[PDB]
Amino acid sequence: EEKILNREIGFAIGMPVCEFDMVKDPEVQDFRRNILNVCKEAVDLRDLNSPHSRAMYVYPPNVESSPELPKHIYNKLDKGQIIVVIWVIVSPNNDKQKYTLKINHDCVPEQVIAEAIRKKTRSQGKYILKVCGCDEYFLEKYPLSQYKYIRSCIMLGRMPNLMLMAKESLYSQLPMTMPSYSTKSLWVINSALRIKILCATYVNIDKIYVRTGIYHGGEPLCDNVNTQRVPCSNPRWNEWLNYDIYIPDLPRAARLCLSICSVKGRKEEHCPLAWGNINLFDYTDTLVSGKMALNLWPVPHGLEDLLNPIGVTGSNPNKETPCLELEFDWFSSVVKFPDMSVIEEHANWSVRENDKEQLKAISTRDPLSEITEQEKDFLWSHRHYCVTIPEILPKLLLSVKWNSRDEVAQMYCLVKDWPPIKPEQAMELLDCNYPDPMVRGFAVRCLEKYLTDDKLSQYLIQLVQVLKYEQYLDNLLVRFLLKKALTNQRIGHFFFWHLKSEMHNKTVSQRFGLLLESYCRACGMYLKHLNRQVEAMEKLINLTDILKQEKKDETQKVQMKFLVEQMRRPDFMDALQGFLSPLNPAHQLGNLRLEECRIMSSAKRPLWLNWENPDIMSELLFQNNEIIFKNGDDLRQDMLTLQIIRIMENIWQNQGLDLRMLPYGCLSIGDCVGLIEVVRNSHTIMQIQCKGGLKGALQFNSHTLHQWLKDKNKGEIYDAAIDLFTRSCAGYCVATFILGIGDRHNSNIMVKDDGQLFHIDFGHFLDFVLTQDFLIVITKTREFERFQEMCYKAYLAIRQHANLFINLFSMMLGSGMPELQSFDDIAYIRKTLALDKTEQEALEYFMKQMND
Ligand SMILES: CNS(=O)(=O)N1CC[C@H](N2CCc3c(-c4cnc(N)nc4)nc(N4CCOCC4)nc32)C1
Numbered sequence: 078e079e080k081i082l083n084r085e086i087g088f089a090i091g092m093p094v095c096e097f098d099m100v101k102d103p104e105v106q107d108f109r110r111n112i113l114n115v116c117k118e119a120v121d122l123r124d125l126n127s128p129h130s131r132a133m134y135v136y137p138p139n140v141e142s143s144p145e146l147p148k149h150i151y152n153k154l155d156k157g158q159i160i161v162v163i164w165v166i167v168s169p170n171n172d173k174q175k176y177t178l179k180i181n182h183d184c185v186p187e188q189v190i191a192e193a194i195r196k197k198t199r200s201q202g203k204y205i206l207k208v209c210g211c212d213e214y215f216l217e218k219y220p221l222s223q224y225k226y227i228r229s230c231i232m233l234g235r236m237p238n239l240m241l242m243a244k245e246s247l248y249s250q251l252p253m254t255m256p257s258y259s260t261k262s263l264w265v266i267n268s269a270l271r272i273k274i275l276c277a278t279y280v281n282i283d284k285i286y287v288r289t290g291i292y293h294g295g296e297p298l299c300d301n302v303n304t305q306r307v308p309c310s311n312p313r314w315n316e317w318l319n320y321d322i323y324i325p326d327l328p329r330a331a332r333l334c335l336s337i338c339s340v341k342g343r344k345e346e347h348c349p350l351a352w353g354n355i356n357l358f359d360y361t362d363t364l365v366s367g368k369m370a371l372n373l374w375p376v377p378h379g380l381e382d383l384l385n386p387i388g389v390t391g392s393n394p395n396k397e398t399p400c401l402e403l404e405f406d407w408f409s410s411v412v413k414f415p416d417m418s419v420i421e422e423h424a425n426w427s428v429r430e431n432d433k434e435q436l437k438a439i440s441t442r443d444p445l446s447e448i449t450e451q452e453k454d455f456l457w458s459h460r461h462y463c464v465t466i467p468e469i470l471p472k473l474l475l476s477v478k479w480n481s482r483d484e485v486a487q488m489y490c491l492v493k494d495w496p497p498i499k500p501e502q503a504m505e506l507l508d509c510n511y512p513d514p515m516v517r518g519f520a521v522r523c524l525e526k527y528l529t530d531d532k533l534s535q536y537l538i539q540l541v542q543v544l545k546y547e548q549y550l551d552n553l554l555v556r557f558l559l560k561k562a563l564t565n566q567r568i569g570h571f572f573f574w575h576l577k578s579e580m581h582n583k584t585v586s587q588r589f590g591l592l593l594e595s596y597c598r599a600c601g602m603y604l605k606h607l608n609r610q611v612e613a614m615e616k617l618i619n620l621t622d623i624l625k626q627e628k629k630d631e632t633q634k635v636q637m638k639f640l641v642e643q644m645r646r647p648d649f650m651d652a653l654q655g656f657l658s659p660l661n662p663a664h665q666l667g668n669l670r671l672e673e674c675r676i677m678s679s680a681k682r683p684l685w686l687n688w689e690n691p692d693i694m695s696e697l698l699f700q701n702n703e704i705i706f707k708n709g710d711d712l713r714q715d716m717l718t719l720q721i722i723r724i725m726e727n728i729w730q731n732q733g734l735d736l737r738m739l740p741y742g743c744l745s746i747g748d749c750v751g752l753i754e755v756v757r758n759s760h761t762i763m764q765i766q767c768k769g770g771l772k773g774a775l776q777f778n779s780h781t782l783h784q785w786l787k788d789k790n791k792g793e794i795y796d797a798a799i800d801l802f803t804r805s806c807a808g809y810c811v812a813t814f815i816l817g818i819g820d821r822h823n824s825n826i827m828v829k830d831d832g833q834l835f836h837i838d839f840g841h842f843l844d845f846v847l848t849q850d851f852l853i854v855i856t857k858t859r860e861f862e863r864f865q866e867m868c869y870k871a872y873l874a875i876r877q878h879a880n881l882f883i884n885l886f887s888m889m890l891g892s893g894m895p896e897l898q899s900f901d902d903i904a905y906i907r908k909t910l911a912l913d914k915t916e917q918e919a920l921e922y923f924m925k926q927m928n929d
Pocket of ligand 1: 754
């Protein structure tokens with residue numbers, strides 16, 4: 078009954094649901110019950126126009142955010158019309174009958190269906206269109222060219238192949254539950270803040286001390302205060318630390334950031350041994366008081382500082398770790414943060430053309446540009462004129478003295494009536510610099526208003542990451558993402574996998590596990606599919622573990638014999654066949670084609686897997702799905718680079734710059750485990766050179782690449798391939814340069830039969846690469862001038878969207894990626910984009926880099 082659902086949820090998360098029942102934290106239990114409101118609202122939205130609304134939940138339209146086709150895409154059409162092939166399965170014999178149409182690019186799915194009925198009768202609105210080869214439907218009245226598949230066909234030159242299907246055939250397959258577990262004002266406390274550091278347990282160099290601070294985000298609200306140094310032992314300090322801040326001046330998001338530091342005498346070497354952060358107010362707005370024990374966390378690699386203020390808040394669940402005992406003051410009553418009306422009353426009681434141009438210039442600086450003390454005072458004094466340049470809100474929020482309740486009360490009034498800003502600008506307000514709940518609430522409301530499901534999917538990795546910067550389990554951001562996940566199954570699929578992949582990380586495991594329980598409880602029959610995906614991934618992790626540890630250096634043929642022997646076991650055959658691809662849940666993975674699978678020779682010995690596509694029309698898309706499974710590489714850097722490449726391509730496409738990129742799929746499934754989408758018909762430059770080269774001859778020649786392209790494209794198709802190569806080469810030259818991608822050797826650069834060039838392996842970023850061989854394919858015979866112009870325009874287009882790229886990296890700051898540990902790492906993009914120069918000065922910098 079409910080025990081069956083809880084067992085399936087437990088297998089999906091990787092931890093039993095009864096472990097959440099054991100958690101005594103009132104915040105945990107209140108989250109579990111209060112989040113059910115979002116579950117019910119999503120379930121009600123699915124039954125609104127049932128069964129059509131339920132079908133659009135399971136099969137949402139995969140569309141672009143704009144119907145307007147850029148001038149260069151419209152030119153690929155035949156007088157604004159497209160040729161589509163509509164297929165029908167006739168039964169008996171399941172014969173595939175096609176009907177070819179020439180219709181307006183903006184025809185809605187029902188108009189396409191009506192035109193197919195006309196063509197079929199040359200030898201009624203109860204039909205739907207499906208993409209041939211995959212479980213993707215056109216269930217919504219969008220213009221046909223707005224669907225990503227159709228838009229992608231126009232660009233790739235391919236002909237769209239759709240399948241006409243009875244509406245009742247699909248609706249019949251759509252499957253048809255609340256769980257059992259369902260004062261003084263802060264401003265009247267006249268005293269200053271003091272916190273007692275009692276003692277530490279589970280700390281066995283010369284002397285030890287506790288480093289403390291009051292922080293709002295990563296900014297200290299007063300000076301940091303340390304306890305006395307004590308000789309190691311299990312130190313007792315019994316010392317009240319006094320902060321230069323009065324209790325009423327404490328902002329709502331104020332935190333205590335602790336560290337147990339060691340001192341080693343030589344000048345003195347100070348090292349943090351463990352760290353922990355505490356919210357000074359709990360989720361119910363109560364200022365903390367009384368005794369409290371905090372279990373600390375291990376210091377993350379590359380900290381450098383003594384405190385970790387960006388780090389997660391709360392006690393380490395492993396209670397066998399350094400444990401610090403603290404005491405807060407009790408003011409003879411439960412103290413609460415004042416209501417918005419009370420703050421409003423205090424904000425009221427708290428009271429040129431050269432200025433307008435200076436405010437406009439400050440507003441246009443990137444998120445990492447430094448804002449001086451004079452500028453902060455200038456912005457705050459003109460705070461009322463600022464509501465007329467809404468894009469200045471991030472700069473104005475950093476000008477506020479958060480340790481002054483008079484300025485904060487006035488900022489709350491400005492935030493309450495601030496005009497909405499674009500989602501790419503509102504995402505800046507969700508990073509670690511903006512912990513204030515009013516600032517975060519405004520940013521979330523801008524996302525609910527202006528974020529399409531396409532853009533939400535595009536930015537999902539950052540939105541799941543910024544959940545770690547939230548003070549509490551229950552917040553506006555989590556409610557927004559969970560609702561969107563429970564009303565769009567494509568969002569829910571990746572939402573589940575982004576959370577599940579981080580369950581090994583104990584700093585987030587409880588937050589993400591509780592969030593996963595509410596998702597699994599309301600996602601419906603998709604939980605059964607997710608369980609099959611989980612089981613296939615576990616079986617592949619076990620298989621690659623044995624391969625890398627036991628048969629580490631065995632031959633490929635002896636490795637395959639173990640693979641085939643393990644795929645003789647019933648549990649393995651069941652687990653690795655008949656499940657949806659986590660890279661794209663529209664792709665069903667049928668039977669494993671072991672004869673096409675292999676253990677790759679590459680580092681960590683990845684698995685190259687091949688499955689039959691069991692779609693009735695598989696031949697019209699791809700008969701087999703190939704996926705690389707890797708155990709050992711942190712695929713998070715690759716995921717982020719692949720997302721950035723996708724965004725850069727959209728920037729270029731919308732500006733009339735057809736620079737074709739290949740952001741293939743990559744998904745992190747857990748700790749250094751994951752999947753990589755195989756681009757079919759592709760080869761590395763090293764493989765192209767070791768094809769033109771013979772047995773014993775040099776595997777090194779700069780004229781081989783252009784020769785292999787000519788053999789693959791003879792005739793009229795040669796001109797198209799050279800143009801595609803030039804455009805894609807231009808895009809990747811600009812991209813790898815701006816992002817500072819390393820290891821750009823001929824085994825990490827690939828080419829497709831059609832001329833399309835792309836890069837792979839992004840283990841290095843944020844710290845130019847071209848060969849003579851590529852120049853031969855593209856020295857300056859008019860083709861180099863056209864290629865140069867492409868690079869210049871591509872470089873400037875990315876420079877105009879620099880704030881978005883800086884923000885996407887800034888939101889990932891708390892992931893733990895070795896190449897992205899502070900805002901100084903992101904400053905590498907400010908240098909390549911030359912944001913400290915003018916538009917013409919940045920182009921000359923880029924031209925000097927290209928000529929070098
Ligand atoms: C075609 N040559 S090959 O002989 O099959 N083979 C020879 C070696 C080469 N390997 C080596 C590593 C590798 C990766 C890869 C692995 N780890 C990360 N982190 N990032 C990318 N990705 C692809 N690709 C295939 C094309 O589509 C995109 C994915 N291939 C790869 C394939």
